[PDB]
């Protein structure tokens, strides 16, 4: 539904991780399925072989936090500048807490039921790919 166009037209891309995170590049195949690629260390660049009309998205390789590419969510091939978005203070706080607490132990933190469910609702690529149908 939100897939890559099978152009067969080679396009040279340079993925630049202009973020403090380890980036996981995700290619959406011809069937809309997300295909992960080898991870980019914090301030690193990589010359990659892609194709015109192919769809890409970049997430944090560990936590799956969403990243921007050339100030937007999706990249269509060329420079792919992967940056942190200005996350909300809530999302940023959830990120830090998730990074300090084991999923099982989230119910042991003295906070409201809504916040437990906010921590449990981890970032996901499939969930993101569904929000992008509207």
């Amino acid at each position: 539904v939100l897939r890559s166009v099978n152009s067969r037209e080679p396009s040279q891309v340079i993925f630049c991780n202009r973020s403090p995170r380890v980036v996981l590049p995700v290619w959406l195949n011809f069937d809309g399925e997300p295909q992960p690629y080898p991870t980019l260390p914090p301030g690193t660049g990589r010359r990659i072989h892609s194709y015109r009309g192919h769809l890409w998205l970049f997430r944090d390789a560990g936590t799956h936090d969403g990243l921007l590419v050339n100030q937007t969510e999706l990249f269509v091939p060329i420079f792919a500048n992967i940056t942190l978005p200005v996350y909300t203070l809530k999302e940023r706080c959830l990120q830090v807490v998730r990074s300090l607490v084991k999923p099982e132990n989230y119910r042991r933190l003295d906070i409201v039921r809504s916040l437990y469910e906010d921590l449990e609702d981890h970032p996901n690529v499939q969930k993101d790919l569904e929000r992008l149908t509207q």
């Binding site: 807490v97 300090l100 607490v101 132990n105 042991r108 933190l109 003295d110």
Partner: protein, 104 residues
């Protein structure tokens, strides 16, 4: 080039930006607009060292590398009680609790 500050006196903290080239006296005029106190009744400090009016904020140590949005630099403020200046006093913020065992 902007610089990000916390202007602090007692339990009062002003959050403002200024140019590296802005002078100490120009910052005093900013405080004046907010706290309704004239530069002559003001004294500004960096780490409890009194800053000269004519010196720029860069010369005073507030730079892009030191005074960031997410981590602003602290400028100390003191008022005059006609005459004599009050001693610099910055009330420390509230203390956070002991880290939960579950987040250690």
């Amino acid at each position: 080039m902007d610089v990000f500050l916390m202007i602090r006196r007692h339990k009062t903290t002003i959050f403002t930006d200024a140019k590296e080239s802005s002078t100490v006296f120009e910052l005093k005029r900013i405080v004046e607009g907010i706290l309704k106190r004239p530069p002559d009744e003001q004294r500004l400090y960096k780490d409890d060292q009194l800053l000269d009016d004519g010196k720029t904020l860069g010369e005073c140590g507030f730079t892009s590398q030191t005074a960031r949005p997410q981590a602003p630099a602290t400028v100390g403020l003191a008022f005059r009680a006609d005459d004599t200046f009050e001693a610099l006093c910055i009330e420390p913020f509230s203390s956070p609790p002991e880290l939960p065992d579950v987040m250690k």
